[PDB]
Amino acid sequence: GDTASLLVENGNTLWPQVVSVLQAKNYTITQRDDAGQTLTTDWVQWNRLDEDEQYRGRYQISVKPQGYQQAVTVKLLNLEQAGKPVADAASMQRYSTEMMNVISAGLDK
């Protein structure tokens, strides 16, 4: 799998918070449209012991209300393993979750 989503119960501006987490991780943001609270990242590397199985992904990240609350969404656009494209369901769901995990950890601090 391919989209992860998370409900955030803040009572507002979750979008600038998510953007700030990504800036703080120094991810390159290749497309960003604040009016639609959506962005696309350049490749993010998932550093791991085994380079011959290091993964990298690109994502579309957004915030949408799901009234009364807001939801953060992470959509895995492309995935590579040691620089070769991959599309296996196990890796796709893991690497969607790994970007969600970055955003969630960032939002707690």
C-alpha span between 21 and 72 (Å, rounded): 13
Q: Which two tokens stand for residue 109?
A: 């601090």
Q: Are 3 and 94 in contact (CB under 8 A)?
A: no
20 binds a copy of itself (CB under 8 A): no
Q: How far is the CB of 91 from a copy of itself (least distance, A)?
A: 7
101 binds a copy of itself (CB under 8 A): yes
Residue 99 DSSP one-character state: H
Q: Which two tokens stand for residue 35?
A: 């009016």
Among 6, 58, 64, 80, binds a copy of itself (CB under 8 A): 6
Nearer to a copy of itself, 29 or 87 (CB): 87
Q: Are 47 and 69 in contact (CB under 8 A)?
A: no
2 binds a copy of itself (CB under 8 A): yes
60 binds a copy of itself (CB under 8 A): no
Map the footprint of a copy of itself across residues 61-100, applying CB under 8 A.
69-70, 89-94, 96-97, 100
Q: Are 51 and 80 in contact (CB under 8 A)?
A: no
Residues that bind a copy of itself (CB under 8 A): 1-11, 69-70, 89-94, 96-97, 100-101, 104-105, 107-109
